[PDB]
Amino acid sequence: VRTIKVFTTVDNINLHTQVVDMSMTYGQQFGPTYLDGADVTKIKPHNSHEGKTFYVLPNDDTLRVEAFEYYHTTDPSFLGRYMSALNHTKKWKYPQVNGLTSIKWADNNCYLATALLTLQQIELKFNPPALQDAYYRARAGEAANFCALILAYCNKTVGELGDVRETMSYLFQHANLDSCKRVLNVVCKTCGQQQTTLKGVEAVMYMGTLSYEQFKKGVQIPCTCGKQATKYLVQQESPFVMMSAPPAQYELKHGTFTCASEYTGNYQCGHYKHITSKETLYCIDGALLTKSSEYKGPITDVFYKENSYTTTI
């Protein structure tokens, strides 16, 4: 019987040589099989498949350990969702706008492009080797495998609308933000004063205000005794801070922030645009670049740089 030899893997770095029967589909010999994202499960082997690398699912205990060491996940449907997203993201265009790698618009990838542009402006270190390698190639322009991993880690599908803030929280869980720490103090005239301390992902993000300076001076917050308490940032140890709020009209000044996310649309249905501060105020809409001196628009997320801050109160 005429046969061929292909390579099966779960991480593309540990290849396993397998012989294939050209009269049996890949689904009968290895189960769900993928070739560069293309589902070749119900396809009989071709002569052109000689020596190529095929993605398979972790069926034995050896591949389950190989998969976790690379992706840091035990989800059996991860590679299926990752290969499915890779089939679309490999056909996307990743131009270099303002020295950053963005995505030309396709299949409603506005939140993915806005997220990819933000990660290239913050100091973040991923723990899964899959994200580390893909991010290293995403900066050079090869962001197809990286964007597919983002959809897989977020349980999102190509064409599904997503939130930039929710995409960050999903990716920050796979980052090394353990050294980050935040100290907060909420003061109330009635019940009193109490200091809280946050660490990790919670010490980086905040929902309520877009101004980092107003976070230091204090922001009004409700209380159990029915009084508007004031919460101010006491101490912050992190390479960056993420300030989030519902999309409202906000003014961006030069040098006071790193990058911002613009959201125009209703809840669960809108358009995302990325705004960065460099030589002036730039606005990136996928492959579209727009320079401006000052900006004013519907802002939902603002990102700042930080080392170590301690308030003086």
Ligand SMILES: *[C@H](CC(=O)OCC)C(=O)NNC(=O)CCc1ccccc1C(=O)N[C@H](C)c1cccc(-c2ccsc2)c1
């Ligand atoms: C891209 C779309 C596109 O390509 O457009 C073509 C011109 C895309 O994916 N855009 N995103 C989108 O539509 C948002 C969907 C979404 C999904 C899950 C959770 C939230 C959202 C969302 O709507 N987020 C925005 C920022 C938002 C608006 C109003 C209120 C809130 C809010 C959050 C907490 S309290 C209030 C958020």
Ligand SMILES: [Cl-]
């Ligand atoms: Cl990394």
Ligand SMILES: [Zn+2]
């Ligand atoms: Zn109180």
